[PDB]
Amino acid sequence: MTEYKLVVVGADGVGKSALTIQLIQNHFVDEYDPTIEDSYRKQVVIDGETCLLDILDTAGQEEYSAMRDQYMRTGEGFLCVFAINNTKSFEDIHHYREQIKRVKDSEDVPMVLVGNKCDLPSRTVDTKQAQDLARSYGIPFIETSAKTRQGVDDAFYTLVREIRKHK
Ligand SMILES: Nc1nc2c(ncn2[C@@H]2O[C@H](COP(=O)(O)OP(=O)(O)CP(=O)(O)O)[C@@H](O)[C@H]2O)c(=O)[nH]1
Ligand SMILES: [Mg+2]
């Protein structure tokens, strides 16, 4: 059975846990409970292949920033999440990407840029600007909503395809 080690990263509050819980449990968490580190092992069929997804839901709190090298070494693909209503979270993306590239000593690590909270009207990050950043990295970009489930399956399945396409 093919196993994929997915790691969800991004700033504190972007919706990493809500995205993961929506993918796995099909419901939206309204409450904000800061994550330390949670892991899920889930079986899914993607493109006719039975996949075992090992999903690591990480801490966005900068206080847990020394925990990152370990999961960056074991992780095969990274869901780099920002929120479309949080400009700082979009600027933090580059720091996450650089750190991943350094830990794995590679310019070609499977990644997907995710612009979450697309259900909200308070956008501060233009879709075109996010698309241009993803293009500069050579990675896919998808907008998602952990609330409506828009783009959620596509974001995780695209990351699996990036790990598989890189393999
Ligand atoms: N409207 C809307 N709210 C969202 C969405 N995703 C998450 N949220 C909300 O944002 C807040 C933080 O979500 P959460 O999933 O805990 O973010 P996180 O990135 O895991 C926080 P931490 O880094 O500390 O673990 C919660 O109030 C949650 O309901 C979304 O797509 N749309
Ligand atoms: Mg969380």
Residue numbers in the entry: 1 to 167
Can I see the authors' text?
KRAS is the most frequently mutated oncogene and belongs to the protein family of small GTPases that function as binary molecular switches involved in cell signaling. Although KRAS could serve as an excellent target for many cancers, no therapeutic agent directly targeting RAS has been clinically approved. The main reason for this is the lack of druggable pockets on the surface of RAS. The shallow, polar pocket situated between the switch I and switch II region of KRAS (SI/II‐pocket) is of particular interest because it is present in the active, oncogenic form of KRAS.
By using GDP‐KRASG12D, we exchanged the nucleotide with the non‐hydrolysable GTP analogue GMP‐PCP (GCP) to yield a novel crystal form amenable to high‐throughput crystallization, which mimics the beta sheet dimeric form of active KRASG12D. By using our approach, a new “snugness of fit” scoring function and the first crystal‐soaking system of the active form of KRASG12D, the protein–ligand X‐ray structures of a tricyclic indolopyrrole fungal alkaloid and an indoloisoquinolinone have been successfully elucidated.
